[PDB]
């Protein structure tokens, strides 16, 4: 037999986020290099002027 | 090469070098001395070639409780996000650290998340004193590392120059 208060499930329970898993998602992008890049440079005796 | 034939037991408050153009390995190196070695107080291994393996390596050495080192600076390295959360990991088990010196060292929005989440009162550090971060690359409008910050400034209690 039972005689008992109306609502009877009950239990307190507390939430919290990770501080981690908080940091925006990663931008959907990958860049294409447009051309080929240079090396220049002169040395020593890479034109002479007589002068 | 020379620098991973280096052993030495007495004194050595400090350990400066400069650039040097340190490979990966001798980072490796060093800190497998500093472990073995329980005696410094500053180190500084500024623009190098040390990546995350280094980064890792000394890390770990230093994220036991025992052999304490007070001064850490590494500036110009590339030490990505990866390198950034090792860090702040052996940060939230290190007790001897003071200055934690992290510039120019390639950091996003994920790896100085998560070093500013790491020096949160609760679970963070009362032993730095000089938390040095630049070039931290937010080029795009990321808005959350600055919260994350601020609820470092709000808890912490033990910085004094940033």
Do not use: W
Not at chain 2, 87 to 92: K, T
Request: aromatic content about 4%.
């Amino acid at each position: 037999l039972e005689e008992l208060t109306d609502t009877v499930p009950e239990a307190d329970t507390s939430t919290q986020t990770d501080a981690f898993l908080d940091r925006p998602p990663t931008p959907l992008f990958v860049p294409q290099k447009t051309g080929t890049d240079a090396i220049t440079q002169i040395e020593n005796g890479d034109l002479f002027d007589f002068d | 090469a020379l620098c991973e034939a280096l052993y030495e037991y007495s004194g050595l408050a400090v350990l400066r070098l400069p650039y040097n153009f340190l490979n990966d390995m001798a980072a490796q190196a060093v800190a497998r001395l500093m472990q073995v070695n329980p005696g410094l107080q500053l180190l500084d291994l500024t623009g190098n070639e040390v990546t995350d393996k280094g980064a890792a390596a000394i890390t770990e050495v230093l994220a036991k409780p025992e052999a304490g080192l007070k001064a850490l600076i590494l500036r110009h390295n590339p030490i990505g996000d990866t390198g950034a959360l090792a860090v702040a990991d052996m940060l939230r088990s290190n007790r001897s650290l003071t200055l934690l010196d992290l510039a120019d060292c390639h950091v996003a929005v994920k790896g100085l998340i998560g070093l500013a989440n790491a020096l949160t009162a609760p679970e963070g550090n009362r032993s730095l004193q000089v938390l040095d971060l630049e070039d931290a690359q937010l080029a795009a409008p990321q808005d959350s590392t600055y919260q994350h910050m601020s609820r470092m400034l709000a808890t912490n209690t033990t910085l004094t120059e940033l």
